[PDB]
Design a binder for these strands. Structure first.
Ligand SMILES: [Mg+2]
Ligand SMILES: [Mg+2]
Ligand SMILES: [Mg+2]
Ligand SMILES: [Mg+2]
Ligand SMILES: [Mg+2]
Ligand SMILES: [Mg+2]
Ligand SMILES: [Mg+2]
Ligand SMILES: [Mg+2]
Ligand SMILES: [Mg+2]
Ligand SMILES: [Mg+2]
Ligand SMILES: [Mg+2]
Ligand SMILES: [Mg+2]
Ligand SMILES: [Mg+2]
Ligand SMILES: [Mg+2]
Ligand SMILES: [Mg+2]
Ligand SMILES: [Mg+2]
Ligand SMILES: [Mg+2]
Ligand SMILES: [Mg+2]
Ligand SMILES: [Mg+2]
Ligand SMILES: [Mg+2]
Ligand SMILES: [Mg+2]
Ligand SMILES: [Mg+2]
Ligand SMILES: [Mg+2]
Ligand SMILES: [Mg+2]
Ligand SMILES: [Mg+2]
Ligand SMILES: [Mg+2]
Ligand SMILES: [Mg+2]
Ligand SMILES: [Mg+2]
Ligand SMILES: [Mg+2]
Ligand SMILES: [Mg+2]
Ligand SMILES: [Mg+2]
Ligand SMILES: [Mg+2]
Ligand SMILES: [Mg+2]
Ligand SMILES: [Mg+2]
Ligand SMILES: [Mg+2]
Ligand SMILES: [Mg+2]
Ligand SMILES: [Mg+2]
Ligand SMILES: [Mg+2]
Ligand SMILES: [Mg+2]
Ligand SMILES: [Mg+2]
Ligand SMILES: [Mg+2]
Ligand SMILES: [Mg+2]
Ligand SMILES: [Mg+2]
Ligand SMILES: [Mg+2]
Ligand SMILES: [Mg+2]
Ligand SMILES: [Mg+2]
Ligand SMILES: [Mg+2]
Ligand SMILES: [Mg+2]
Ligand SMILES: [Mg+2]
Ligand SMILES: [Mg+2]
Ligand SMILES: [Mg+2]
Ligand SMILES: [Mg+2]
Ligand SMILES: [Mg+2]
Ligand SMILES: [Mg+2]
Ligand SMILES: [Mg+2]
Ligand SMILES: [Mg+2]
Ligand SMILES: [Mg+2]
Ligand SMILES: [Mg+2]
Ligand SMILES: [Mg+2]
Ligand SMILES: [Mg+2]
Ligand SMILES: [Mg+2]
Ligand SMILES: [Mg+2]
Ligand SMILES: [Mg+2]
Ligand SMILES: [Mg+2]
Ligand SMILES: [Mg+2]
Ligand SMILES: [Mg+2]
Ligand SMILES: [Mg+2]
Ligand SMILES: [Mg+2]
Ligand SMILES: [Mg+2]
Ligand SMILES: [Mg+2]
Ligand SMILES: [Mg+2]
Ligand SMILES: [Mg+2]
Ligand SMILES: [Mg+2]
Ligand SMILES: [Mg+2]
Ligand SMILES: [Mg+2]
Ligand SMILES: [Mg+2]
Ligand SMILES: [Mg+2]
Ligand SMILES: [Mg+2]
Ligand SMILES: [Mg+2]
Ligand SMILES: [Mg+2]
Ligand SMILES: [Mg+2]
Ligand SMILES: [Mg+2]
Ligand SMILES: [Mg+2]
Ligand SMILES: [Mg+2]
Ligand SMILES: [Mg+2]
Ligand SMILES: [Mg+2]
Ligand SMILES: [Mg+2]
Ligand SMILES: [Mg+2]
Ligand SMILES: [Mg+2]
Ligand SMILES: [Mg+2]
Ligand SMILES: [Mg+2]
Ligand SMILES: [Mg+2]
Ligand SMILES: [Mg+2]
Ligand SMILES: [Mg+2]
Ligand SMILES: [Mg+2]
Ligand SMILES: [Mg+2]
Ligand SMILES: [Mg+2]
Ligand SMILES: [Mg+2]
Ligand SMILES: [Mg+2]
Ligand SMILES: [Mg+2]
Ligand SMILES: [Mg+2]
Ligand SMILES: [Mg+2]
Ligand SMILES: [Mg+2]
Ligand SMILES: [Mg+2]
Ligand SMILES: [Mg+2]
Ligand SMILES: [Mg+2]
Ligand SMILES: [Mg+2]
Ligand SMILES: [Mg+2]
Ligand SMILES: [Mg+2]
Ligand SMILES: [Mg+2]
Ligand SMILES: [Mg+2]
Ligand SMILES: [Mg+2]
Ligand SMILES: [Mg+2]
Ligand SMILES: [Mg+2]
Ligand SMILES: [Mg+2]
Ligand SMILES: [Mg+2]
Ligand SMILES: [Mg+2]
Ligand SMILES: [Mg+2]
Ligand SMILES: [Mg+2]
Ligand SMILES: [Mg+2]
Ligand SMILES: [Mg+2]
Ligand SMILES: [Mg+2]
Ligand SMILES: [Mg+2]
Ligand SMILES: [Mg+2]
Ligand SMILES: [Mg+2]
Ligand SMILES: [Mg+2]
Ligand SMILES: [Mg+2]
Ligand SMILES: [Mg+2]
Ligand SMILES: [Mg+2]
Ligand SMILES: [Mg+2]
Ligand SMILES: [Mg+2]
Ligand SMILES: [Mg+2]
Ligand SMILES: [Mg+2]
Ligand SMILES: [Mg+2]
Ligand SMILES: [Mg+2]
Ligand SMILES: [Mg+2]
Ligand SMILES: [Mg+2]
Ligand SMILES: [Mg+2]
Ligand SMILES: [Mg+2]
Ligand SMILES: [Mg+2]
Ligand SMILES: [Mg+2]
Ligand SMILES: [Mg+2]
Ligand SMILES: [Mg+2]
Ligand SMILES: [Mg+2]
Ligand SMILES: [Mg+2]
Ligand SMILES: [Mg+2]
Ligand SMILES: [Mg+2]
Ligand SMILES: [Mg+2]
Ligand SMILES: [Mg+2]
Ligand SMILES: [Mg+2]
Ligand SMILES: [Mg+2]
Ligand SMILES: [Mg+2]
Ligand SMILES: [Mg+2]
Ligand SMILES: [Mg+2]
Ligand SMILES: [Mg+2]
Ligand SMILES: [Mg+2]
Ligand SMILES: [Mg+2]
Ligand SMILES: [Mg+2]
Ligand SMILES: [Mg+2]
Ligand SMILES: [Mg+2]
Ligand SMILES: [Mg+2]
Ligand SMILES: [Mg+2]
Ligand SMILES: [Mg+2]
Ligand SMILES: [Mg+2]
Ligand SMILES: [Mg+2]
Ligand SMILES: [Mg+2]
Ligand SMILES: [Mg+2]
Ligand SMILES: [Mg+2]
Ligand SMILES: [Mg+2]
Ligand SMILES: [Mg+2]
Ligand SMILES: [Mg+2]
Ligand SMILES: [Mg+2]
Ligand SMILES: [Mg+2]
Ligand SMILES: [Mg+2]
Ligand SMILES: [Mg+2]
Ligand SMILES: [Mg+2]
Ligand SMILES: [Mg+2]
Ligand SMILES: [Mg+2]
Ligand SMILES: [Mg+2]
Ligand SMILES: [Mg+2]
Ligand SMILES: [Mg+2]
Ligand SMILES: [Mg+2]
Ligand SMILES: [Mg+2]
Ligand SMILES: [Mg+2]
Ligand SMILES: [Mg+2]
Ligand SMILES: [Mg+2]
Ligand SMILES: [Mg+2]
Ligand SMILES: [Mg+2]
Ligand SMILES: [Mg+2]
Ligand SMILES: [Mg+2]
Ligand SMILES: [Mg+2]
Ligand SMILES: [Mg+2]
Ligand SMILES: [Mg+2]
Ligand SMILES: [Mg+2]
Ligand SMILES: [Mg+2]
Ligand SMILES: [Mg+2]
Ligand SMILES: [Mg+2]
Ligand SMILES: [Mg+2]
Ligand SMILES: [Mg+2]
Ligand SMILES: [Mg+2]
Ligand SMILES: [Mg+2]
Ligand SMILES: [Mg+2]
Ligand SMILES: [Mg+2]
Ligand SMILES: [Mg+2]
Ligand SMILES: [Mg+2]
Ligand SMILES: [Mg+2]
Ligand SMILES: [Mg+2]
Ligand SMILES: [Mg+2]
Ligand SMILES: [Mg+2]
Ligand SMILES: [Mg+2]
Ligand SMILES: [Mg+2]
Ligand SMILES: [Mg+2]
Ligand SMILES: [Mg+2]
Ligand SMILES: [Mg+2]
Ligand SMILES: [Mg+2]
Ligand SMILES: [Mg+2]
Ligand SMILES: [Mg+2]
Ligand SMILES: [Mg+2]
Ligand SMILES: [Mg+2]
Ligand SMILES: [Mg+2]
Ligand SMILES: [Mg+2]
Ligand SMILES: [Mg+2]
Ligand SMILES: [Mg+2]
Ligand SMILES: [Mg+2]
Ligand SMILES: [Mg+2]
Ligand SMILES: [Mg+2]
Ligand SMILES: [Mg+2]
Ligand SMILES: [Mg+2]
Ligand SMILES: [Mg+2]
Ligand SMILES: [Mg+2]
Ligand SMILES: [Zn+2]
Lengths: 59, 204, 137, 74, 122, 118
RNA sequence: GCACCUCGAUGUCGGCUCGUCGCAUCCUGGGGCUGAAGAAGGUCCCAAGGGUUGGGCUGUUCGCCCAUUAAAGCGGCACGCGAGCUGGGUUCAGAACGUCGUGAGACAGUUCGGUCUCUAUCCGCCACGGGCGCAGGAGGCUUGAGGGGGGCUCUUCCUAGUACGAGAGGACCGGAAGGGACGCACCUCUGGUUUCCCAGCUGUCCCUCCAGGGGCAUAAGCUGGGUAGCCAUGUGCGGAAGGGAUAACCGCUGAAAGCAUCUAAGCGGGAAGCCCGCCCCAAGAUGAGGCCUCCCACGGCGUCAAGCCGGUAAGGACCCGGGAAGACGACCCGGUGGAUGGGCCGGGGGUGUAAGCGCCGCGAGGCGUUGAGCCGACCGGUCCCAAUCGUCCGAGGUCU
RNA sequence: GCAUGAGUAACGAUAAAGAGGGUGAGAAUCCCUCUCGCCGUAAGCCCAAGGGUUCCUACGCAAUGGUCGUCAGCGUAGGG
RNA sequence: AGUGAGGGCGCGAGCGAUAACGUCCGCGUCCGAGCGCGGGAACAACCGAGACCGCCAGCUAAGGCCCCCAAGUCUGGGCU
């Protein structure tokens, strides 16, 4: 190894270009059949504690 | 040209004239024709074959209509045997005789991201005698200021297998029509359960 | 679509039944079809069964024995059509499934470690004396 | 005559490694061979190796002609 | 599965006992030699007043190997040693006795004398 | 590759990974329901299942086997005397895993609960 | 030789690794002449497709030698390759011999020792995605422009002991069989591994005193084995056949030039080479192609914009259960109208006779119950558990 | 003074963790309990140097802590 | 004041090998300082020509006039 090193400063254009993919995705969400509160799908509702009709855990 | 679709089921060996013979087994039959390719319509000759019956409760409307114009219940795979124009309606494993010779095509097993030793059989470095951390490494990849670049297609690590592979001139050891079975002497690319295509061989 | 059954089905036509049961440690005499230039005669081969590796029809077994000084191992397809028969020369009780370790024992030690399997010998004298009253009258 | 050129052995630094300064002249009819990596100059060595090879094929024939004369007298 | 440097017991009465393989005589660059194949070998040790002496370079043919040999009938065979018989340039045995079994492959490969002189062919 | 290999590694070596399953099996059989990272929850699902199923056999041999992993005489009794009855007419699947809607703050680990059934 | 770039640094031999190009060709292929009888050899021409071994000695390159071989080619690529490795050589400081010098020291003289720098920004290269485009939107199946890969060779036998030869030897043409290396794929066999699949064992600490077990001795304590998977030493298969155009070279017909001339018009033959043929990539082939099938008409504004808003259509994406797919993406299967993972059950397979009790022996133990007990992945079954319920996007087709 | 490399290398021994309960605006990281592992001629205990309040109590988290922090050899006061 | 490293080309000599983008002199020239403009594909010094600034005017030089690319697919006459 002989310590590779950037030959030129990266231009603002080229820096930001790289970050064209860095953008975040909004959380995917669904309404609870019970309390109609938004929540992530396939997870037990944190608001009312129901999943698949049943009360799973107590909120 | 003639050929059929099928699924690789596995290997064993049979005995024949007191010699053992390794075989891979292929479930071929049957295969309904779904469309023929004329030169008037398509500019070439081939037949689309159906294979493995499909749950209609999963077939969508464009797919269903193609299947109607055929007049055959839906199917999971559509593939063409080029320059094969079956006189009959459904292609059966019957199209092969014991003794014939076949080219088989399947997808090879998938090595994922593969070293230069597994992908290309490079020797790598010495397991001892001084080597600083290059035990499986590719060595030099070029010259110097001339050409000052790497050849296109230089052998390097990368994805290996999981690709179209055809093995030539396999002997048909045996066929078992009442099970739609096919016995081929040798090995056939890809895992069991995989799709395969069995063409009549091209070697004279 | 049983991939397995499909395979076992193919084999079924080639399966044997006639060969007798045996285990590692048993001494065994395989009469085998061989080729002398033109002809085909039977050669016997007899030694300790040092190993059986099962895989349905594809199961096989290794016999070890010494001849004229040199030790020899032979590996037989259990359903080989070249096996004419198999004789049980003697039965012994091994404490494990793979007996390669006897590769390095004096024929005295080999003898001391591999005692005769009385139970299975008794059963063997028991049976066959069993099936004999109908092979009669 | 076959002449071989190649890199000399031992001291010299940069230059001794990148310079085919060693000479090996093989006189074909007799199989007699000399080598010279004395000086840094390749022809200074070819000169020397041509000098020795000369003296050695001469001396080899003189001896032949000697134990012919010396043994025809016996 | 013999290769250069491999030692072998000599299974004859030429007077050698150990020879070390130095070349296998299949092909331009054959990796290993097996039963029925011919090797060039050096005599590494021998009994007094035998025909072959130590340091003789000789031809020989492998008759037994520790690596099991496969067979078309699906069988296989393996011995406890690697053995060979020294042979002349016409590939005939330079001895008059061979010792221990030899592998049936010798028959097919050609070596007929060796098979006769053998105590048992396996 | 990894083709057709079964079983998680969970960034632990063999000796630790096993203790992990046991210590989670202890806790689960103890409290009836626990909260863990989702992958641990899925491995543990089958591990507790098999021990419970052994208790359904009730015999001494079964008890001595289950002791090896649970190590607690007291706890094992609860399993045989109180948990196994509850399942005499149920073939496997004595356990269930449900994913939660909350991650951990400090490392963002997705959580899930694992519990015995009715 | 010169001193033109480089002394605010262009790391210098050999080895290893990976090669690629040249052809003045080492081998294989096709030829002419021969002091070519045949077999061989010599010399020259064409030909770069592929091939071109393993060791002893020395740091060696070179070279000698052993054993083979069809052959063991020669060169370029900073005498290719140290941000790829080595560091034996060379080229610091130690030390010694010979040697030169009064000396300090010195030596294309020799000898022993002697720090080789984790992070790749751009180009290049191997792989894999995201975006947009492909003037209606889709789901499939395809065409192959242009690329890539591959291309080696030997021995034996028949023809036939024939043609040839005094003999020794010994063919062309045509046909057959078995090899070496290399390539691709595979796990039936052979052979490895198989970090907890089974068993045995030592020490110690613990549970519970016995029995039985558990921890630790490695990140498996050790040992004997070992499925699936990944594998080579194992198995299959490959190079071709053939079509076309040619090179050197051999010819037909044929003038100029009454004859002759392979050529000036025209024709035939002819290489492991060329173009096809075989395998693989492939429509970002912006020259964005083709075929089958599906969806439909605008719901409203907007002059100048073929624009916009925004519900839907065929469909698609999201999330979830998974996957011989995989770094992540991607790809494939499945999501209750369900066998996708987990458990349970069966089969296969591994280990090799569990615990408990009974009997025998003072006992260590032995025998029986017993091929028992345990039993990853493989092949299947089973809704017991888990893929709940849902959400978002997506035409309404510009002009002659 | 501020960029680039770049949300990249690294987060300092591969002795190892898990769950429950509590506290709190906030908890993988604080407290309590059970389980697991590691050291044990030490990785335990006691002197001497050196360091100079780091000791105990209560309140507290901006910074220090390679993350977090309700915790601390950190901040404030009191005591010793 | 600066300069007292010059360089290329043509010609005349020495050295060199009637080698060198070689070296050393002599006459001239240009680059140096005209790496400003046209030509010679590209190109300090070869051909043309010495740029004070502006113009959507004109003539010529070298070199060119088939397309890239301005102007003759010009006109006679030969050769290959
Ligand atoms: Mg910006
Ligand atoms: Mg993203
Ligand atoms: Mg709802
Ligand atoms: Mg919410
Ligand atoms: Mg046909
Ligand atoms: Mg049909
Ligand atoms: Mg049909
Ligand atoms: Mg019909
Ligand atoms: Mg029909
Ligand atoms: Mg019909
Ligand atoms: Mg048919
Ligand atoms: Mg994979
Ligand atoms: Mg290679
Ligand atoms: Mg490397
Ligand atoms: Mg270049
Ligand atoms: Mg290359
Ligand atoms: Mg790479
Ligand atoms: Mg891939
Ligand atoms: Mg590949
Ligand atoms: Mg292929
Ligand atoms: Mg049928
Ligand atoms: Mg196969
Ligand atoms: Mg043909
Ligand atoms: Mg016969
Ligand atoms: Mg086995
Ligand atoms: Mg014996
Ligand atoms: Mg005795
Ligand atoms: Mg027994
Ligand atoms: Mg019997
Ligand atoms: Mg030379
Ligand atoms: Mg040297
Ligand atoms: Mg040089
Ligand atoms: Mg030089
Ligand atoms: Mg030079
Ligand atoms: Mg000198
Ligand atoms: Mg050979
Ligand atoms: Mg090989
Ligand atoms: Mg075989
Ligand atoms: Mg000889
Ligand atoms: Mg045989
Ligand atoms: Mg005999
Ligand atoms: Mg992989
Ligand atoms: Mg791996
Ligand atoms: Mg880890
Ligand atoms: Mg870890
Ligand atoms: Mg980690
Ligand atoms: Mg609780
Ligand atoms: Mg258990
Ligand atoms: Mg209890
Ligand atoms: Mg129940
Ligand atoms: Mg000068
Ligand atoms: Mg100059
Ligand atoms: Mg160096
Ligand atoms: Mg090498
Ligand atoms: Mg090279
Ligand atoms: Mg040649
Ligand atoms: Mg030739
Ligand atoms: Mg010739
Ligand atoms: Mg002659
Ligand atoms: Mg000549
Ligand atoms: Mg070539
Ligand atoms: Mg080439
Ligand atoms: Mg070559
Ligand atoms: Mg070598
Ligand atoms: Mg060497
Ligand atoms: Mg050496
Ligand atoms: Mg030398
Ligand atoms: Mg050499
Ligand atoms: Mg030769
Ligand atoms: Mg050599
Ligand atoms: Mg080269
Ligand atoms: Mg050179
Ligand atoms: Mg070189
Ligand atoms: Mg050079
Ligand atoms: Mg070179
Ligand atoms: Mg090198
Ligand atoms: Mg280096
Ligand atoms: Mg180097
Ligand atoms: Mg070096
Ligand atoms: Mg040395
Ligand atoms: Mg040195
Ligand atoms: Mg150095
Ligand atoms: Mg020293
Ligand atoms: Mg020194
Ligand atoms: Mg002096
Ligand atoms: Mg002196
Ligand atoms: Mg010298
Ligand atoms: Mg000297
Ligand atoms: Mg030392
Ligand atoms: Mg050293
Ligand atoms: Mg050092
Ligand atoms: Mg160092
Ligand atoms: Mg760049
Ligand atoms: Mg990749
Ligand atoms: Mg990838
Ligand atoms: Mg791809
Ligand atoms: Mg893309
Ligand atoms: Mg993205
Ligand atoms: Mg458009
Ligand atoms: Mg397609
Ligand atoms: Mg193409
Ligand atoms: Mg093409
Ligand atoms: Mg091609
Ligand atoms: Mg090619
Ligand atoms: Mg090629
Ligand atoms: Mg050969
Ligand atoms: Mg012949
Ligand atoms: Mg024939
Ligand atoms: Mg004959
Ligand atoms: Mg004769
Ligand atoms: Mg004769
Ligand atoms: Mg005659
Ligand atoms: Mg024929
Ligand atoms: Mg022939
Ligand atoms: Mg042939
Ligand atoms: Mg093997
Ligand atoms: Mg195995
Ligand atoms: Mg113990
Ligand atoms: Mg213990
Ligand atoms: Mg006890
Ligand atoms: Mg315990
Ligand atoms: Mg412990
Ligand atoms: Mg263990
Ligand atoms: Mg064993
Ligand atoms: Mg083992
Ligand atoms: Mg083990
Ligand atoms: Mg094993
Ligand atoms: Mg296995
Ligand atoms: Mg081999
Ligand atoms: Mg192979
Ligand atoms: Mg082959
Ligand atoms: Mg031509
Ligand atoms: Mg005429
Ligand atoms: Mg004429
Ligand atoms: Mg004529
Ligand atoms: Mg011609
Ligand atoms: Mg003509
Ligand atoms: Mg023609
Ligand atoms: Mg022609
Ligand atoms: Mg012609
Ligand atoms: Mg032709
Ligand atoms: Mg050709
Ligand atoms: Mg070519
Ligand atoms: Mg490609
Ligand atoms: Mg395509
Ligand atoms: Mg394709
Ligand atoms: Mg396409
Ligand atoms: Mg596209
Ligand atoms: Mg299209
Ligand atoms: Mg919408
Ligand atoms: Mg996935
Ligand atoms: Mg998915
Ligand atoms: Mg993945
Ligand atoms: Mg399931
Ligand atoms: Mg069902
Ligand atoms: Mg099972
Ligand atoms: Mg069973
Ligand atoms: Mg079993
Ligand atoms: Mg036990
Ligand atoms: Mg018992
Ligand atoms: Mg069993
Ligand atoms: Mg069993
Ligand atoms: Mg398991
Ligand atoms: Mg369910
Ligand atoms: Mg459910
Ligand atoms: Mg749903
Ligand atoms: Mg909405
Ligand atoms: Mg318009
Ligand atoms: Mg920064
Ligand atoms: Mg930054
Ligand atoms: Mg980030
Ligand atoms: Mg991060
Ligand atoms: Mg990185
Ligand atoms: Mg760092
Ligand atoms: Mg660090
Ligand atoms: Mg990192
Ligand atoms: Mg809690
Ligand atoms: Mg703490
Ligand atoms: Mg503990
Ligand atoms: Mg503790
Ligand atoms: Mg102690
Ligand atoms: Mg001490
Ligand atoms: Mg310690
Ligand atoms: Mg203390
Ligand atoms: Mg103090
Ligand atoms: Mg301090
Ligand atoms: Mg303070
Ligand atoms: Mg505070
Ligand atoms: Mg305060
Ligand atoms: Mg703070
Ligand atoms: Mg804070
Ligand atoms: Mg820190
Ligand atoms: Mg404080
Ligand atoms: Mg205060
Ligand atoms: Mg105090
Ligand atoms: Mg002055
Ligand atoms: Mg002045
Ligand atoms: Mg001056
Ligand atoms: Mg100057
Ligand atoms: Mg001047
Ligand atoms: Mg001048
Ligand atoms: Mg000039
Ligand atoms: Mg001039
Ligand atoms: Mg002159
Ligand atoms: Mg001259
Ligand atoms: Mg001149
Ligand atoms: Mg000149
Ligand atoms: Mg000249
Ligand atoms: Mg000049
Ligand atoms: Mg001059
Ligand atoms: Mg002048
Ligand atoms: Mg100018
Ligand atoms: Mg001027
Ligand atoms: Mg300039
Ligand atoms: Mg100018
Ligand atoms: Mg110009
Ligand atoms: Mg020019
Ligand atoms: Mg210039
Ligand atoms: Mg110039
Ligand atoms: Mg210019
Ligand atoms: Mg200038
Ligand atoms: Mg001019
Ligand atoms: Mg002029
Ligand atoms: Mg004028
Ligand atoms: Mg004008
Ligand atoms: Mg003029
Ligand atoms: Mg003019
Ligand atoms: Mg022009
Ligand atoms: Mg122009
Ligand atoms: Mg124009
Ligand atoms: Zn809710």
């Amino acid at each position: 190894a002989k310590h590779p090193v950037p030959k030129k400063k990266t231009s603002k254009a080229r820096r930001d270009a790289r970050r064209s993919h860095h953008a975040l995705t909004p959380p995917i969400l669904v309404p609870c059949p019970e309390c109609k509160a938004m929540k992530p799908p396939h997870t037990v509702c944190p608001e009312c504690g129901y999943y698949a009709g049943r009360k799973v855990l107590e909120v | 040209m003639k050929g059929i679709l099928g699924v690789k089921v596995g290997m064993t060996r049979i005995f024949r004239d007191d010699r053992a013979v390794p075989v891979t087994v292929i479930l071929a039959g049957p295969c309904p024709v779904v469309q023929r390719r004329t030169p008037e319509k398509d500019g070439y000759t081939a037949v689309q074959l159906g294979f493995l019956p499909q749950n209609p409760k999963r077939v969508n409307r464009p797919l269903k209509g193609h299947f109607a114009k055929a007049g055959v219940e839906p199917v999971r795979i559509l593939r063409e045997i080029r320059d094969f124009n079956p006189e009959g309606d459904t292609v059966t494993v019957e199209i092969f005789k014991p003794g014939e010779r076949v080219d088989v095509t399947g997808t090879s097993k998938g090595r994922g991201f593969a070293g230069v030793m597994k992908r290309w059989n490079f020797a790598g470095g010495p397991d001892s005698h001084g080597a600083h951390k290059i035990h499986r490494h590719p060595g030099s990849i070029g010259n110097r200021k001339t050409p000052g670049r790497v050849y296109k297609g230089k052998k390097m690590a990368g994805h290996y297998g999981a690709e179209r592979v055809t093995v030539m001139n396999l002997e048909v050891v045996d066929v078992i029509p009442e099970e739609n079975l096919l016995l081929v002497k040798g090995a056939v690319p890809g895992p069991n359960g995989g799709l395969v295509i069995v063409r009549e061989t091209k070697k004279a | 679509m049983n991939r397995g059954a499909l395979i076992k089905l193919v084999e079924s036509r080639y399966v044997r039944t006639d060969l007798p049961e045996f285990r590692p440690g048993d001494t065994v005499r395989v009469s085998y079809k061989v080729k002398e230039g033109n002809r085909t005669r039977i050669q016997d081969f007899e030694g300790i069964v040092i190993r059986i590796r099962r895989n349905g029809f594809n199961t096989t077994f290794t016999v070890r024995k010494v001849s004229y000084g040199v030790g020899v191992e032979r590996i037989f397809p259990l359903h080989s059509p070249l096996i004419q028969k198999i004789d049980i020369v003697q039965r012994g009780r091994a404490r494990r499934a793979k007996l390669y370790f006897i590769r390095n024992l004096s024929d005295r030690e080999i003898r001391r470690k591999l005692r005769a399997d009385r139970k299975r010998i008794d059963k063997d004298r028991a049976a066959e004396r069993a099936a004999k009253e109908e092979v009669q009258k | 005559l076959r002449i071989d050129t190649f890199r000399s052995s031992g001291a010299g630094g940069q230059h001794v490694n990148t310079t085919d300064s060693a000479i090996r002249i093989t006189h074909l009819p007799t199989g007699i061979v000399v080598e010279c990596q004395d000086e840094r100059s390749q022809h200074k060595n070819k000169a020397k190796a041509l000098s020795v090879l000369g003296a050695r094929i001469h001396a080899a024939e003189m001896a032949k002609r000697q134990q012919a004369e010396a043994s025809t007298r016996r | 599965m013999i290769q250069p440097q491999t030692y072998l017991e000599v299974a004859d009465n030429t007077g050698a006992r150990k020879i070390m393989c130095i070349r296998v005589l299949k092909g331009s660059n054959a990796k290993y030699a097996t039963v029925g194949d011919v090797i060039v070998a050096s005599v590494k040790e021998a009994i007094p007043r035998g025909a072959v002496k130590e340091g003789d370079v000789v031809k020989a043919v492998v008759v037994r190997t520790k690596k099991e040999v496969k067979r078309p009938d699906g069988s296989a065979i393996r011995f406890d040693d690697n053995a060979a018989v020294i042979i002349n340039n016409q590939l005939e045995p330079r001895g008059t006795r061979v010792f221990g079994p030899v592998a049936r492959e010798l028959r097919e490969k050609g070596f007929m004398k060796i098979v006769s002189l053998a105590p048992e062919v396996l | 590759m990894r083709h057709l290999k079964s079983g998680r590694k969970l960034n632990r070596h063999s000796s630790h990974r096993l203790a992990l399953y046991r210590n989670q099996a202890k806790s689960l059989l103890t409290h009836g329901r626990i909260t863990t990272t989702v992958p641990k929850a899925k491995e543990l699902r089958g591990f507790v299942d098999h021990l419970i199923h052994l208790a359904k056999r009730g015999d001494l041999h079964a008890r001595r086997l289950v002791l090896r992993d649970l190590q607690d005489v007291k706890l094992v009794r609860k399993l045989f005397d109180e948990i196994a009855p509850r399942y005499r007419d149920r073939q496997g699947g004595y356990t269930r895993v449900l994913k939660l809607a909350e991650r951990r703050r400090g490392d963002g680990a997705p959580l899930a609960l694992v519990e015995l059934v009715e």
